[PDB]
């Protein structure tokens, strides 16, 4: 009976909440109250990367912390040298509606996708020297919201068809499908060991997936509206989510519950993008009100603000070496901050 | 040395700027359009007629008086639109196609009105004009002339509604057909005249799926949209 199954899930639901409540000794704020505040974090715009015609949804830093790729609705992928502000590549896209971009860790490939429901793979290191499409990964029935390379042959994609997919780029096939979300999957984040990844969806929940087993280990609730952004904490044992409910939250994997909420009464707009600093002490979040807020990840205090962009801050990225932050925006500009 | 590298990098950067400047001229010379409609709106027939005169998303390109129009039709997306609708915040207009004969899914027209309300009052679409196609006009006339419609059953305000004085009936149109037409338009204009605030505009049109005037109707609304934008920038 459907009602019997519906009740059984509800009963187990209560047990998981009781199990989570049993492990709640003290709040992270109680543990952290003796820590010194980080103080006022004052960051300035060191660079403004100009050249995109339309708004930017996505940027991704290279593992060299110097090159970075950005995607604009004008149908362009632009690879920047952030040190010199010189453009290295300008890749025209077949579909102008691009929603995500990824840079491979090796630096040999970039990926992008959007409303065409395709992850396009680009070879940056062709013999002829011209960037060509390596693969088109088809099989998602909804738009791609996020993609992240594992290596030159594997990439993980999240889609508006409520699924995540792991692709073998050479064959162009889905080796694994990750199902269990009921809303659009908006963002994904690989663990530092790339054995697991987390996704945040429009069902206001975040799920932890095992890549090789292709199954959901854990589901995280606490947000009220759609989750737009997600990022692992540097040690890989926690992650942070930004939502349309105008809050950021930190979830601990092993505690299996929400750990802290980042919000203020003056903030009534959703978060579009989140990222940790190199040590994870700072949580940076892009907002709909054109600003980025720097949070003390341990104390839930706004340490600072990035206030340069004239339109929606859509995307965020902190370099691997922790030197700089990039903000992409709907005003078609990339800014670099220290 | 390094100077050979950095001069090479500036040499590559200027080829991109040369190409990006060319791309900018084409981008500003094209008007992008989002075609939104329910499946039973007649929107697919509309795309087909324009194709003979001249997938997660379908694109068609038509040219009216040497002006480029790029129309995008959603395919293979879920009915959840609250995320991917934000991609079209900067199109010239959203072409919203409505089946006007669909009041008798119990009430498709009430669903079309709710969708228009969400589009009109979304924060990211505040500056986006909407061209409203009231499509099944031929079917609306045939239904209301038979006496089986009973619009009052789905819209009780239709009992007390009177045809506005500015109404321009088509030749040979029954006053009942004319009255039913303008009531549904006034359903959409009640939403549009609230919160429009002189930033985005609604251009309703009584269409049919096989009208050859539709591309001209879109062209004339786009030029009106562009002119109003320019006059706003000059504070006129």
């Amino acid at each position: 009976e459907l009602d019997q199954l519906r009740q059984e899930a509800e009963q187990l639901k209560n047990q998981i909440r009781d199990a989570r409540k049993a492990c709640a000794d003290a709040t992270l704020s109680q543990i952290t109250n003796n820590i010194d505040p980080v103080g006022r974090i004052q960051m300035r715009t060191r660079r403004t990367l100009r050249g995109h015609l339309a708004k930017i949804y996505a940027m991704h830093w290279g593992t060299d912390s110097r090159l970075l790729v950005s995607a604009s609705q004008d149908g362009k992928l632009i690879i920047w040298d952030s040190y010199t502000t010189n453009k290295v590549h300008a890749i025209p896209l077949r579909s102008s509606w691009v929603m995500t971009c990824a840079y491979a860790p090796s630096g040999n490939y970039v990926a992008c996708g959007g409303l065409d429901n395709i992850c396009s793979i680009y070879n940056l290191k062709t013999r002829e020297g011209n960037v060509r499409v390596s693969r088109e990964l088809a099989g998602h029935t909804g738009y791609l919201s996020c993609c992240r390379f594992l290596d030159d042959n594997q990439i993980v994609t999240s889609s508006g068809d409520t699924t995540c997919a792991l692709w073998d780029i050479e064959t162009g096939q889905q080796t694994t499908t990750f199902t269990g979300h009921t809303g659009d999957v908006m963002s994904l984040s690989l663990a530092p060991d790339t054995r697991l990844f987390v996704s945040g969806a429009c069902d206001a929940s975040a799920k932890l997936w095992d890549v090789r087993e292709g199954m959901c280990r854990q589901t995280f609730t606490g947000h009220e509206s759609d989750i737009n952004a997600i990022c692992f904490f540097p040690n890989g044992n926690a992650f942070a989510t930004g939502s349309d409910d105008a809050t950021c939250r930190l979830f601990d994997l092993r505690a299996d519950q929400e750990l802290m909420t980042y919000s203020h009464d003056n903030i009534i707009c959703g978060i579009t993008s989140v990222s940790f600093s190199k040590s994870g002490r700072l949580l940076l979040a892009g907002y709909d009100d054109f600003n980025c807020n720097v949070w003390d990840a341990l104390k839930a205090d706004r340490a600072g603000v990035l206030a340069g962009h004239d339109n929606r801050v859509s995307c965020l990225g902190v370099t691997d070496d922790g030197m700089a932050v990039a903000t992409g925006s709907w005003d078609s500009f990339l800014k670099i901050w220290n | 040395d390094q100077r050979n590298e950095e001069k090479a990098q500036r040499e590559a950067n200027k080829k991109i700027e040369k190409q990006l400047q060319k791309d900018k001229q084409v981008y500003r010379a094209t008007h992008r359009l989002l075609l939104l409609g329910a499946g039973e709106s007649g929107k697919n027939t509309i795309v087909k007629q324009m194709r003979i005169l001249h997938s997660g998303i379908f694109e068609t390109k038509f040219q009216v008086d040497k002006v480029n129009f790029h129309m995008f039709d959603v395919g293979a997306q879920r009915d959840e639109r609250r995320k991917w609708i934000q991609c079209f915040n900067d199109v010239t207009a959203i072409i919203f196609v409505v089946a006007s004969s669909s009041y008798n899914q119990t009430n498709r027209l009430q669903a079309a009105l709710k969708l228009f309300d969400s589009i009109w009052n979304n924060k990211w679409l505040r500056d986006t004009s909407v061209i409203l196609f009231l499509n099944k006009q031929d079917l609306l006339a045939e239904k209301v002339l038979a006496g089986k419609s009973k619009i009052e059953d789905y819209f009780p305000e239709f009992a007390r509604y009177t045809t506005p004085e500015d109404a321009t009936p088509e030749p040979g149109e029954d006053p009942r057909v004319t009255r039913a037409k303008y009531f549904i338009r006034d359903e959409f204009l009640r939403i549009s005249t609230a919160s429009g605030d002189g930033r985005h505009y609604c251009y309703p049109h009584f269409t049919c799926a096989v009208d050859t005037e539709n591309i001209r109707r879109v062209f004339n609304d786009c030029r009106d949209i562009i002119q109003r934008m320019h006059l706003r920038q000059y504070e006129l």
Partner: nanobody, 126 residues
Framework: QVQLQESGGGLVQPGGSLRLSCAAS????????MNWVRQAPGKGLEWVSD????????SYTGSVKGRFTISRDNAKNTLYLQMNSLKPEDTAVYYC?????????????????????RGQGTQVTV
């Protein structure tokens, strides 16, 4: 966790009233615009009524005008639908749906087939 629980449905003869209650939890109830939607047998989901954050602005589908009344109590986090003089075509499963984002005039997708912020409806047969 966002949860909506509907109650008060039943079997009623035509012309008899029912009062539906929606118990809400897992979000700030006062920040959201609430909705009532139905699904008749063999048909799609249909929007019935909505109420704004404070309860001031109210809308109905034409078929229930002057017949159904929507009410909210922010203090108790409850949504109400008092249905009077029911008709046989009011027979449906009634869902309490919440608008997806807070502080928004627009309300997208509440009638979608797999909308998340919707309860498991209560059956009403007339």
């Amino acid at each position: 966790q966002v949860q909506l629980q509907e109650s008060g449905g039943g079997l009623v003869q035509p012309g008899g009233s029912l009062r539906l209650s929606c118990a809400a939890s897992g979000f700030t109830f006062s920040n959201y615009k609430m909705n009532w939607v139905r699904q008749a047998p063999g048909k799609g989901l249909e929007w019935v009524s909505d109420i704004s954050q404070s309860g001031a602005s109210i809308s109905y589908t034409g078929s229930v005008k002057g017949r159904f009344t929507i009410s909210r109590d922010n203090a108790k986090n409850t949504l109400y639908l008092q249905m009077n003089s029911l008709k046989p075509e009011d027979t449906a499963v009634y869902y309490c749906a919440r608008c997806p984002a807070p502080f928004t005039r627009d309300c997208f997708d509440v009638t979608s087939t797999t909308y998340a912020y919707r309860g498991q409806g209560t059956q009403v047969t007339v």
